[PDB]
């Protein structure tokens, strides 16, 4: 399925994902498109930070959902 991610430039990118994909894998697919290393990524959906180790299905992220990417560091 397709989901959307709003990135640090404000652009909305598309990702090709499956419900059993881990958040770490979603971060790796963001790196593949946008170059941002996964340890610097924090993904937000419906007001929750998405934990590494959990899956898209754990957060009920269904097709055509939009996630928000923010920087995880302290500075920025």
Residue numbers in the entry: 1 to 76
Can you list sentences taken from the study reporting this PDB entry?
The post-translational modification of proteins with ubiquitin (Ub) modulates an expanding array of cellular processes. Ub is attached to a target protein through the formation of an isopeptide bond between a lysine in the target protein and the C terminus of the Ub. Ub is a target for post-translational modifications, including acetylation (Ohtake et al., 2015) and phosphorylation (Kane et al., 2014, Kazlauskaite et al., 2014, Koyano et al., 2014). Several sites of phosphorylation (Thr7, Thr12, Thr14, Ser20, Ser57, Tyr59, Ser65, and Thr66) have been identified on Ub within mammalian cells.
Here we used genetic code expansion to express and purify multi-milligram quantities of Ub bearing homogeneous phosphorylation at Ser20 (Ub [pSer20]), Ser57 (Ub [pSer57]), and Ser65 (Ub [pSer65]) from E. coli and to solve the structure of Ub (pSer20). Phosphoserine was directed into the protein using an evolved SepRS/tRNACUA pair, an approach that we previously demonstrated allows the production of homogeneous and site-specifically phosphorylated Ub and other phosphoproteins (Rogerson et al., 2015). We obtained crystals for Ub (pSer20), which diffracted to 1.55 Å and showed clear density for the phosphate group. This underscores the quantity and purity of proteins obtained using the evolved SepRS/tRNACUA pair (Rogerson et al., 2015). We conclude that phosphorylation at Ser20, Ser57, or Ser65 does not affect the first two steps of the ubiquitination cascade with the E2s tested. We conclude that Ser20 phosphorylation on Ub changes UBE3C from a dual-specificity ligase that makes K48- and K29-linked chains with unmodified Ub to a ligase that makes predominantly Ser20 phosphorylated K48-linked chains with Ser20 phosphorylated Ub. Our results suggest that the phosphorylation of Ser20 in Ub may shut down the formation of K29-linked Ub chains formed by UBE3C, and this may enable the proteasome to resume proteolysis and aid cellular recovery following proteolytic stress. Ser20 phosphorylation increased OTUD3-mediated cleavage of K11-linked Ub, but it decreased OTUD3-mediated cleavage of K48 linkage.
